[PDB]
Amino acid sequence: DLIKYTIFNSSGIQIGNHNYMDVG
Amino acid sequence: DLIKYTIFNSSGIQIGNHNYMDVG
Amino acid sequence: DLIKYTIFNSSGIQIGNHNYMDVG
Amino acid sequence: DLIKYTIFNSSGIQIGNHNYMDVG
Amino acid sequence: DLIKYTIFNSSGIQIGNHNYMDVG
C-alpha cells in the first residue's frame, strides 16, 4: 500500500512487480 | 495506493507493474 | 490512487503499467 | 486518481498506461 | 504493506516481486 524508495547515484533500478529488465 | 520514489542521478529506471524494458 | 515521483538527472524512465520500452 | 511527477533533465520518459515507446 | 529502501552508490538494484534482471 505504501512504497517509498530513496536511491542516490545508481543504474539498472528494477523496483516493480513482475518486471523484466536486462542490462548489457 | 501510495507510491513515492526519490532517485537522483541514475539510468534505466524501471518502476512499474508488468513492465518490459531492456538496456543495451 | 496516489502516484508521486521525484527523479533528477536520469534516462530511460519507465514508470507506468503494462508499458514496453527498450533502450538501445 | 492522483498522478504527480517531477522529473528534471531526462529523456525517454514513459509514464503512462499500456504505452509502447522504444528509444534508439 | 510498507516498503522502505535507502541505497547510496550502487548498481543492478533488483528490489521487486517476481522480477527478472540480468547484469552483463
Side-chain angles (χ1 to χ4, degrees), chain A, chain B:
Chain A
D1 295 317
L2 279 154
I3 297 173
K4 295 180 180 180
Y5 274 83
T6 302
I7 301 170
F8 276 75
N9 308 311
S10 67
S11 63
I13 301 171
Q14 189 178 56
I15 305 170
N17 300 298
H18 301 285
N19 281 355
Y20 191 101
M21 167 163 56
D22 286 344
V23 180
Chain B
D1 295 317
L2 279 154
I3 297 173
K4 295 180 180 180
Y5 274 83
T6 302
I7 301 170
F8 276 75
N9 308 311
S10 67
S11 63
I13 301 171
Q14 189 178 56
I15 305 170
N17 300 298
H18 301 285
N19 281 355
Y20 191 101
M21 167 163 56
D22 286 344
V23 180

CSV table of all heavy atoms in Angstrom, one decimal, chain A, chain B:
chain,number,residue,atom,x,y,z
A,1,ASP,N,0.9,-1.2,0.0
A,1,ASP,CA,0.0,0.0,0.0
A,1,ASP,C,0.9,1.2,0.0
A,1,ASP,O,0.6,2.2,-0.7
A,1,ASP,CB,-0.9,0.0,1.2
A,1,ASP,CG,-1.9,-1.2,1.2
A,1,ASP,OD1,-2.4,-1.4,0.1
A,1,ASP,OD2,-2.0,-1.8,2.2
A,2,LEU,N,2.0,1.2,0.8
A,2,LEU,CA,2.9,2.3,0.8
A,2,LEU,C,4.3,1.9,0.4
A,2,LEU,O,5.0,1.1,1.0
A,2,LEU,CB,3.0,2.8,2.3
A,2,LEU,CG,1.8,3.7,2.6
A,2,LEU,CD1,1.5,3.7,4.1
A,2,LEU,CD2,2.1,5.2,2.2
A,3,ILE,N,4.7,2.5,-0.8
A,3,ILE,CA,6.0,2.2,-1.3
A,3,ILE,C,6.9,3.4,-1.3
A,3,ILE,O,6.5,4.4,-2.0
A,3,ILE,CB,5.9,1.6,-2.7
A,3,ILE,CG1,5.1,0.3,-2.7
A,3,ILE,CG2,7.2,1.4,-3.3
A,3,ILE,CD1,4.8,-0.1,-4.1
A,4,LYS,N,8.0,3.4,-0.6
A,4,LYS,CA,8.9,4.5,-0.6
A,4,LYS,C,10.4,4.0,-0.9
A,4,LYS,O,10.8,3.1,-0.4
A,4,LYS,CB,8.9,5.2,0.8
A,4,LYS,CG,7.5,5.8,1.0
A,4,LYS,CD,7.5,6.4,2.4
A,4,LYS,CE,6.1,7.1,2.6
A,4,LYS,NZ,6.1,7.7,4.0
A,5,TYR,N,11.0,4.8,-1.8
A,5,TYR,CA,12.4,4.4,-2.2
A,5,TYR,C,13.3,5.6,-2.2
A,5,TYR,O,12.9,6.7,-2.7
A,5,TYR,CB,12.4,3.7,-3.6
A,5,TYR,CG,12.1,2.3,-3.4
A,5,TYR,CD1,10.8,1.8,-3.3
A,5,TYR,CD2,13.2,1.3,-3.4
A,5,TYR,CE1,10.5,0.4,-3.1
A,5,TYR,CE2,12.9,0.0,-3.3
A,5,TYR,CZ,11.6,-0.5,-3.1
A,5,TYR,OH,11.3,-1.8,-3.0
A,6,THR,N,14.5,5.5,-1.7
A,6,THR,CA,15.5,6.6,-1.8
A,6,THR,C,16.8,6.0,-2.3
A,6,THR,O,17.6,5.4,-1.6
A,6,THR,CB,15.7,7.2,-0.4
A,6,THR,OG1,14.4,7.7,0.1
A,6,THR,CG2,16.7,8.3,-0.5
A,7,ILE,N,17.1,6.3,-3.6
A,7,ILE,CA,18.3,5.8,-4.2
A,7,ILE,C,19.1,6.9,-4.8
A,7,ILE,O,18.6,7.7,-5.6
A,7,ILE,CB,18.0,4.8,-5.3
A,7,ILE,CG1,17.2,3.6,-4.6
A,7,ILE,CG2,19.3,4.2,-5.9
A,7,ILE,CD1,16.7,2.7,-5.8
A,8,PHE,N,20.4,7.1,-4.4
A,8,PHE,CA,21.2,8.1,-4.9
A,8,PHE,C,22.4,7.5,-5.7
A,8,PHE,O,23.1,6.7,-5.2
A,8,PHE,CB,21.8,9.0,-3.8
A,8,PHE,CG,20.7,10.0,-3.5
A,8,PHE,CD1,19.6,9.7,-2.7
A,8,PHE,CD2,21.0,11.4,-3.9
A,8,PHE,CE1,18.6,10.7,-2.4
A,8,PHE,CE2,20.0,12.3,-3.5
A,8,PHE,CZ,18.9,12.0,-2.8
A,9,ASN,N,22.6,8.0,-7.0
A,9,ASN,CA,23.7,7.5,-7.8
A,9,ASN,C,23.7,6.0,-8.0
A,9,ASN,O,24.3,5.2,-7.2
A,9,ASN,CB,25.0,7.9,-7.1
A,9,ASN,CG,25.0,9.4,-6.7
A,9,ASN,OD1,24.7,10.2,-7.6
A,9,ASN,ND2,25.4,9.7,-5.5
A,10,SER,N,22.9,5.6,-9.0
A,10,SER,CA,22.8,4.2,-9.3
A,10,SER,C,22.3,4.0,-10.7
A,10,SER,O,22.0,4.9,-11.4
A,10,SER,CB,21.8,3.5,-8.3
A,10,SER,OG,20.5,4.0,-8.6
A,11,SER,N,22.3,2.7,-11.2
A,11,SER,CA,21.9,2.4,-12.5
A,11,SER,C,21.2,1.0,-12.5
A,11,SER,O,21.5,0.2,-11.7
A,11,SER,CB,23.0,2.4,-13.5
A,11,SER,OG,24.0,1.4,-13.1
A,12,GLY,N,20.3,0.8,-13.5
A,12,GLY,CA,19.6,-0.5,-13.6
A,12,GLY,C,18.7,-0.7,-12.4
A,12,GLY,O,18.8,-1.8,-11.8
A,13,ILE,N,17.9,0.3,-12.1
A,13,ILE,CA,17.0,0.2,-11.0
A,13,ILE,C,15.7,-0.6,-11.4
A,13,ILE,O,14.9,0.0,-12.1
A,13,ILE,CB,16.6,1.6,-10.5
A,13,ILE,CG1,17.9,2.3,-10.1
A,13,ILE,CG2,15.7,1.5,-9.3
A,13,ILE,CD1,17.6,3.8,-9.8
A,14,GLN,N,15.5,-1.8,-10.9
A,14,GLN,CA,14.3,-2.5,-11.1
A,14,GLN,C,13.5,-2.7,-9.9
A,14,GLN,O,13.7,-3.6,-9.1
A,14,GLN,CB,14.7,-3.9,-11.6
A,14,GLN,CG,13.4,-4.7,-12.1
A,14,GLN,CD,13.8,-6.0,-12.7
A,14,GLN,OE1,14.4,-6.8,-12.0
A,14,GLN,NE2,13.4,-6.3,-13.9
A,15,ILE,N,12.6,-1.7,-9.6
A,15,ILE,CA,11.7,-1.8,-8.5
A,15,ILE,C,10.3,-1.7,-8.9
A,15,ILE,O,9.6,-0.7,-8.9
A,15,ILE,CB,12.0,-0.6,-7.6
A,15,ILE,CG1,13.5,-0.5,-7.2
A,15,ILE,CG2,11.2,-0.7,-6.3
A,15,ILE,CD1,13.8,0.8,-6.5
A,16,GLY,N,9.8,-2.9,-9.2
A,16,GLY,CA,8.4,-3.1,-9.6
A,16,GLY,C,7.9,-4.5,-9.4
A,16,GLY,O,8.6,-5.3,-8.8
A,17,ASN,N,6.7,-4.8,-10.0
A,17,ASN,CA,6.1,-6.1,-9.8
A,17,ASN,C,6.0,-6.8,-11.2
A,17,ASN,O,5.5,-6.3,-12.1
A,17,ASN,CB,4.7,-6.0,-9.2
A,17,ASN,CG,4.8,-5.4,-7.8
A,17,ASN,OD1,5.4,-5.9,-6.9
A,17,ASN,ND2,4.2,-4.2,-7.6
A,18,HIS,N,6.6,-8.0,-11.3
A,18,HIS,CA,6.6,-8.8,-12.5
A,18,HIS,C,7.2,-8.0,-13.6
A,18,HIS,O,6.6,-7.8,-14.7
A,18,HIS,CB,5.1,-9.1,-12.8
A,18,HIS,CG,4.5,-9.9,-11.7
A,18,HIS,ND1,4.8,-11.2,-11.5
A,18,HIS,CD2,3.6,-9.6,-10.7
A,18,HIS,CE1,4.1,-11.7,-10.4
A,18,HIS,NE2,3.4,-10.7,-9.9
A,19,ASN,N,8.4,-7.4,-13.4
A,19,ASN,CA,9.0,-6.6,-14.4
A,19,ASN,C,10.2,-7.4,-15.0
A,19,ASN,O,10.8,-8.2,-14.4
A,19,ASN,CB,9.6,-5.3,-13.7
A,19,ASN,CG,8.4,-4.3,-13.6
A,19,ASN,OD1,7.3,-4.6,-14.0
A,19,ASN,ND2,8.6,-3.2,-12.9
A,20,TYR,N,10.5,-7.1,-16.3
A,20,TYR,CA,11.6,-7.7,-16.9
A,20,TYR,C,12.6,-6.6,-17.5
A,20,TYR,O,12.2,-5.8,-18.4
A,20,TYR,CB,11.1,-8.6,-18.1
A,20,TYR,CG,12.2,-9.5,-18.6
A,20,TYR,CD1,12.3,-10.8,-18.2
A,20,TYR,CD2,13.2,-8.9,-19.5
A,20,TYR,CE1,13.4,-11.6,-18.6
A,20,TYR,CE2,14.2,-9.7,-19.9
A,20,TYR,CZ,14.3,-11.1,-19.5
A,20,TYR,OH,15.4,-11.9,-20.0
A,21,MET,N,13.8,-6.6,-17.1
A,21,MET,CA,14.8,-5.7,-17.5
A,21,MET,C,16.2,-6.2,-17.4
A,21,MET,O,16.7,-6.6,-16.4
A,21,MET,CB,14.7,-4.4,-16.6
A,21,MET,CG,15.9,-3.5,-16.8
A,21,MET,SD,15.6,-1.9,-16.2
A,21,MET,CE,15.2,-2.4,-14.5
A,22,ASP,N,16.8,-6.3,-18.6
A,22,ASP,CA,18.2,-6.8,-18.6
A,22,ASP,C,19.2,-5.7,-19.0
A,22,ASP,O,18.9,-4.8,-19.8
A,22,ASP,CB,18.3,-7.9,-19.7
A,22,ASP,CG,17.7,-9.2,-19.2
A,22,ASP,OD1,17.5,-9.3,-18.0
A,22,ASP,OD2,17.4,-10.0,-20.0
A,23,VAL,N,20.3,-5.7,-18.3
A,23,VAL,CA,21.3,-4.6,-18.6
A,23,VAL,C,22.6,-5.2,-19.2
A,23,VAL,O,23.2,-6.1,-18.7
A,23,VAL,CB,21.7,-4.0,-17.2
A,23,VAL,CG1,22.8,-2.9,-17.5
A,23,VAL,CG2,20.5,-3.4,-16.6
A,24,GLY,N,22.9,-4.7,-20.4
A,24,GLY,CA,24.0,-5.2,-21.2
A,24,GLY,C,24.1,-4.5,-22.5
A,24,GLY,O,24.5,-3.4,-22.6
B,1,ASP,N,-1.4,1.8,-3.1
B,1,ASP,CA,-2.3,3.1,-3.1
B,1,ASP,C,-1.4,4.3,-3.1
B,1,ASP,O,-1.7,5.3,-3.8
B,1,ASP,CB,-3.2,3.0,-1.9
B,1,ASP,CG,-4.1,1.9,-1.9
B,1,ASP,OD1,-4.7,1.6,-3.0
B,1,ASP,OD2,-4.3,1.2,-0.9
B,2,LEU,N,-0.3,4.3,-2.3
B,2,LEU,CA,0.6,5.4,-2.2
B,2,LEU,C,2.0,5.0,-2.7
B,2,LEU,O,2.7,4.2,-2.1
B,2,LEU,CB,0.7,5.9,-0.8
B,2,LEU,CG,-0.5,6.8,-0.5
B,2,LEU,CD1,-0.8,6.8,1.0
B,2,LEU,CD2,-0.2,8.2,-0.9
B,3,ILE,N,2.4,5.6,-3.9
B,3,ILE,CA,3.7,5.3,-4.4
B,3,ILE,C,4.6,6.5,-4.4
B,3,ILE,O,4.3,7.5,-5.1
B,3,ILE,CB,3.6,4.7,-5.8
B,3,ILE,CG1,2.8,3.4,-5.8
B,3,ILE,CG2,5.0,4.5,-6.4
B,3,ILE,CD1,2.5,2.9,-7.2
B,4,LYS,N,5.7,6.4,-3.7
B,4,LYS,CA,6.7,7.6,-3.7
B,4,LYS,C,8.1,7.1,-4.0
B,4,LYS,O,8.5,6.1,-3.4
B,4,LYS,CB,6.6,8.2,-2.3
B,4,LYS,CG,5.2,8.8,-2.1
B,4,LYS,CD,5.2,9.5,-0.7
B,4,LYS,CE,3.8,10.1,-0.4
B,4,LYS,NZ,3.8,10.8,0.9
B,5,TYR,N,8.7,7.8,-4.9
B,5,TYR,CA,10.1,7.5,-5.3
B,5,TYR,C,11.0,8.7,-5.3
B,5,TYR,O,10.6,9.7,-5.8
B,5,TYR,CB,10.1,6.8,-6.7
B,5,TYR,CG,9.8,5.3,-6.5
B,5,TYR,CD1,8.5,4.9,-6.4
B,5,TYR,CD2,10.9,4.4,-6.5
B,5,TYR,CE1,8.2,3.5,-6.2
B,5,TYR,CE2,10.6,3.0,-6.4
B,5,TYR,CZ,9.3,2.6,-6.2
B,5,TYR,OH,9.0,1.2,-6.1
B,6,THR,N,12.2,8.5,-4.8
B,6,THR,CA,13.2,9.6,-4.9
B,6,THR,C,14.5,9.1,-5.4
B,6,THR,O,15.3,8.5,-4.7
B,6,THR,CB,13.4,10.2,-3.5
B,6,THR,OG1,12.1,10.7,-3.0
B,6,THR,CG2,14.4,11.4,-3.6
B,7,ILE,N,14.8,9.3,-6.7
B,7,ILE,CA,16.0,8.9,-7.3
B,7,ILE,C,16.8,10.0,-7.9
B,7,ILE,O,16.3,10.8,-8.7
B,7,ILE,CB,15.7,7.8,-8.4
B,7,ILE,CG1,14.9,6.7,-7.7
B,7,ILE,CG2,17.0,7.3,-9.0
B,7,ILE,CD1,14.4,5.8,-8.9
B,8,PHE,N,18.1,10.1,-7.5
B,8,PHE,CA,19.0,11.2,-8.0
B,8,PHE,C,20.1,10.6,-8.8
B,8,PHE,O,20.9,9.7,-8.3
B,8,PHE,CB,19.5,12.0,-6.9
B,8,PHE,CG,18.5,13.1,-6.5
B,8,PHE,CD1,17.3,12.7,-5.8
B,8,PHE,CD2,18.7,14.4,-6.9
B,8,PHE,CE1,16.4,13.7,-5.5
B,8,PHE,CE2,17.7,15.4,-6.6
B,8,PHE,CZ,16.6,15.0,-5.9
B,9,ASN,N,20.3,11.0,-10.0
B,9,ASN,CA,21.4,10.6,-10.9
B,9,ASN,C,21.4,9.1,-11.1
B,9,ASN,O,22.0,8.3,-10.3
B,9,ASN,CB,22.8,10.9,-10.2
B,9,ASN,CG,22.8,12.4,-9.8
B,9,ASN,OD1,22.4,13.3,-10.6
B,9,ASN,ND2,23.1,12.8,-8.6
B,10,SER,N,20.6,8.6,-12.1
B,10,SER,CA,20.5,7.2,-12.4
B,10,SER,C,20.0,7.0,-13.8
B,10,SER,O,19.7,8.0,-14.5
B,10,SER,CB,19.5,6.6,-11.4
B,10,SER,OG,18.2,7.1,-11.7
B,11,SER,N,20.0,5.8,-14.3
B,11,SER,CA,19.6,5.4,-15.6
B,11,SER,C,18.9,4.1,-15.6
B,11,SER,O,19.2,3.2,-14.8
B,11,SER,CB,20.7,5.5,-16.6
B,11,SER,OG,21.7,4.5,-16.2
B,12,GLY,N,18.0,3.8,-16.6
B,12,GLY,CA,17.4,2.6,-16.7
B,12,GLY,C,16.4,2.3,-15.5
B,12,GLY,O,16.5,1.3,-14.9
B,13,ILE,N,15.6,3.3,-15.2
B,13,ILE,CA,14.7,3.2,-14.1
B,13,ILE,C,13.4,2.5,-14.5
B,13,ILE,O,12.6,3.0,-15.2
B,13,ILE,CB,14.3,4.6,-13.6
B,13,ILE,CG1,15.6,5.4,-13.2
B,13,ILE,CG2,13.4,4.5,-12.4
B,13,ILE,CD1,15.3,6.8,-12.9
B,14,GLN,N,13.3,1.3,-14.0
B,14,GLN,CA,12.0,0.5,-14.2
B,14,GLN,C,11.2,0.4,-12.9
B,14,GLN,O,11.4,-0.6,-12.2
B,14,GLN,CB,12.4,-0.9,-14.7
B,14,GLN,CG,11.1,-1.6,-15.2
B,14,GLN,CD,11.5,-3.0,-15.8
B,14,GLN,OE1,12.1,-3.8,-15.1
B,14,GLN,NE2,11.2,-3.3,-17.0
B,15,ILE,N,10.3,1.3,-12.7
B,15,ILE,CA,9.4,1.3,-11.6
B,15,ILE,C,8.0,1.3,-12.0
B,15,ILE,O,7.4,2.4,-12.0
B,15,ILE,CB,9.7,2.5,-10.6
B,15,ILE,CG1,11.2,2.5,-10.3
B,15,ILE,CG2,8.9,2.4,-9.4
B,15,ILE,CD1,11.6,3.9,-9.6
B,16,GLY,N,7.5,0.1,-12.3
B,16,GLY,CA,6.1,0.0,-12.7
B,16,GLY,C,5.6,-1.4,-12.5
B,16,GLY,O,6.3,-2.3,-11.9
B,17,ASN,N,4.4,-1.7,-13.0
B,17,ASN,CA,3.8,-3.1,-12.9
B,17,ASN,C,3.7,-3.8,-14.3
B,17,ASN,O,3.2,-3.2,-15.2
B,17,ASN,CB,2.4,-3.0,-12.3
B,17,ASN,CG,2.5,-2.3,-10.9
B,17,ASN,OD1,3.2,-2.8,-10.0
B,17,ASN,ND2,1.9,-1.2,-10.7
B,18,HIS,N,4.3,-5.0,-14.3
B,18,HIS,CA,4.3,-5.7,-15.6
B,18,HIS,C,4.9,-4.9,-16.7
B,18,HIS,O,4.3,-4.8,-17.8
B,18,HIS,CB,2.8,-6.1,-15.9
B,18,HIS,CG,2.2,-6.8,-14.8
B,18,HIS,ND1,2.5,-8.2,-14.6
B,18,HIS,CD2,1.3,-6.5,-13.8
B,18,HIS,CE1,1.8,-8.6,-13.5
B,18,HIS,NE2,1.1,-7.6,-13.0
B,19,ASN,N,6.1,-4.4,-16.5
B,19,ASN,CA,6.7,-3.6,-17.5
B,19,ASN,C,7.9,-4.3,-18.1
B,19,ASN,O,8.5,-5.2,-17.5
B,19,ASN,CB,7.3,-2.3,-16.8
B,19,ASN,CG,6.1,-1.3,-16.7
B,19,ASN,OD1,5.0,-1.5,-17.1
B,19,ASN,ND2,6.4,-0.1,-16.0
B,20,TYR,N,8.2,-4.0,-19.4
B,20,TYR,CA,9.3,-4.6,-20.0
B,20,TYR,C,10.3,-3.6,-20.6
B,20,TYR,O,9.9,-2.8,-21.5
B,20,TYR,CB,8.8,-5.5,-21.2
B,20,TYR,CG,9.9,-6.4,-21.7
B,20,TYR,CD1,10.1,-7.7,-21.3
B,20,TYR,CD2,10.9,-5.9,-22.6
B,20,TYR,CE1,11.1,-8.5,-21.7
B,20,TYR,CE2,11.9,-6.7,-23.0
B,20,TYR,CZ,12.0,-8.0,-22.6
B,20,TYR,OH,13.1,-8.8,-23.1
B,21,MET,N,11.5,-3.6,-20.1
B,21,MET,CA,12.5,-2.6,-20.6
B,21,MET,C,13.9,-3.2,-20.5
B,21,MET,O,14.4,-3.5,-19.4
B,21,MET,CB,12.4,-1.4,-19.7
B,21,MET,CG,13.6,-0.5,-19.9
B,21,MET,SD,13.3,1.2,-19.3
B,21,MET,CE,12.9,0.7,-17.6
B,22,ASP,N,14.6,-3.3,-21.7
B,22,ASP,CA,15.9,-3.7,-21.7
B,22,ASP,C,16.9,-2.6,-22.1
B,22,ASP,O,16.6,-1.7,-22.9
B,22,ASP,CB,16.0,-4.8,-22.8
B,22,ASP,CG,15.4,-6.1,-22.3
B,22,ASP,OD1,15.2,-6.2,-21.1
B,22,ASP,OD2,15.1,-7.0,-23.1
B,23,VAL,N,18.1,-2.6,-21.4
B,23,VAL,CA,19.0,-1.6,-21.7
B,23,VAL,C,20.3,-2.2,-22.3
B,23,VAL,O,20.9,-3.1,-21.8
B,23,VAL,CB,19.5,-1.0,-20.3
B,23,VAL,CG1,20.5,0.1,-20.6
B,23,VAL,CG2,18.2,-0.3,-19.7
B,24,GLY,N,20.6,-1.6,-23.5
B,24,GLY,CA,21.7,-2.1,-24.3
B,24,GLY,C,21.8,-1.4,-25.6
B,24,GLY,O,22.3,-0.3,-25.7
